[PDB]
Design a protein around this ligand. Structure first.
Ligand SMILES: c1ccc(-c2ncccn2)nc1
Ligand SMILES: [Zn+2]
Length: 361
């Protein structure tokens, strides 16, 4: 494509940081008061803020009125029960025998109910947003699954609040062959990263005709954040002029491509199933394929970008996009996304690439 064109796109994209940060401030305030009022309840005592997502990864673009926050909650001594070889969805039981468990009320049998937890969560949040008349914050009717609550700050800002269980235990076995960063960020880093906790968000699993509503999906957004904000083989990568790479620029460009394409065909349902996480996952795989900083030279911004696109396209055609942490978990399976959508997105991206990306202007 050429470096300078994409770079112009990146300038135009860079112009929104001030506004996005300004809204992020208000979000921060509201969420702060919320968490302050949430820790009162015995069930959500050890609840806290989890600073992950596009904003904290410094890759959020062109959506200042939309934010996603995650609330983490420490669940000690838990036992995970894998659902139907899905490798990613789990039942949360408790290995702890005493009734000292603060989540006993949400225990539907030996298994911890996600429905009860989410219900109490939404209830407490509703009461606490009703309690405050200082700021103009209102909840929203239930729609999505993983985004538990949806808030509206003033009558402009929109915040998606997600709840996540935190486990300081060692990661599930399905993550064993994942996080292939050995040749990129070193085995040492992979080793110390796996010593960090893992998270679980309430997400129902698709069987085909019905959905299991009492399951939890693995989450490693903190690991994604760490990797993105420390992305080079060199520790001083992007800390001086001679060591400037174009990884994050490529990620931004991909995210922007998908956003613009989703916007152009928004009156249909073809691209509704695709999200930024797909793009990010593909990006991480490309990073694994090209572990050297010299393969991400600034002047090569064009080629690199194409690389990403190319790989993404491949994932579309072969209907295979492995989760970066859970290899046997396929984000692009026919169960999750139908062939027609993938072929449509392939068609569009290929057109764009064949005509110097007119969607970038
Ligand atoms: C954080 C954000 C999104 C996701 C996800 N999005 C779509 C399909 C599967 N996972 N996972 C983690
Ligand atoms: Zn770098």
């Amino acid at each position: 494509m050429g470096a300078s064109k994409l770079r112009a796109v990146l300038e135009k994209l860079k112009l929104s940081r001030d506004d996005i940060s300004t809204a992020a401030g208000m979000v921060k305030g509201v969420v702060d008061h919320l968490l302050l009022r949430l820790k009162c309840d015995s069930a959500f005592r050890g609840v806290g803020l989890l600073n992950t997502g596009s904003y904290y990864e410094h890759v959020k673009i062109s959506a200042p009125n939309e934010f996603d926050v995650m609330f983490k909650l420490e669940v000690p001594r838990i036992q995970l029960e894998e659902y139907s070889n899905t490798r990613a969805y789990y039942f949360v039981k408790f290995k702890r025998n005493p009734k000292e468990n603060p989540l006993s009320q949400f225990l539907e049998g030996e298994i911890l109910s996600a429905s009860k937890m989410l219900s109490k969560f939404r209830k407490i949040i509703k009461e606490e947003i009703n309690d405050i008349k200082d700021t103009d914050v209102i909840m929203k009717r239930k729609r999505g699954g993983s985004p538990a609550v949806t808030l509206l700050i003033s009558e402009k800002i929109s915040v998606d609040i997600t709840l996540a269980l935190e486990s300081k235990s060692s990661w599930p076995a399905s993550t064993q062959e994942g996080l292939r960063i050995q040749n990129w960020l070193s085995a040492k880093v992979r080793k110390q990263l796996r010593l960090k906790p893992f998270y679980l968000v309430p997400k129902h699993a698709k069987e085909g005709n019905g959905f299991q509503e009492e399951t939890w999906r693995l989450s490693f957004s903190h690991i994604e954040k760490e990797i993105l904000n420390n992305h080079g083989k060199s520790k001083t990568c992007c800390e001086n002029k001679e060591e400037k790479c174009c990884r994050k620029d490529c990620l931004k460009l991909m995210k922007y491509l998908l956003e613009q394409l989703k916007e152009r065909f928004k009156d249909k349902k073809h691209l509704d199933k695709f999200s930024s996480y797909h793009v990010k996952t593909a990006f991480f795989h490309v990073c694994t394929q090209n572990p050297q900083d010299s393969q991400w030279d600034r002047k090569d911004l064009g080629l690199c970008f194409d690389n990403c696109v190319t790989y993404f396209l491949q994932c579309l055609r072969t209907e295979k996009l492995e989760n970066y942490f859970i290899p046997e978990f396929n984000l692009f399976s026919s169960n999750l996304i139908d062939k027609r959508s993938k072929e449509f997105l392939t068609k569009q991206i290929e057109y764009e690439r064949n005509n110097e990306f007119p969607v970038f202007d």
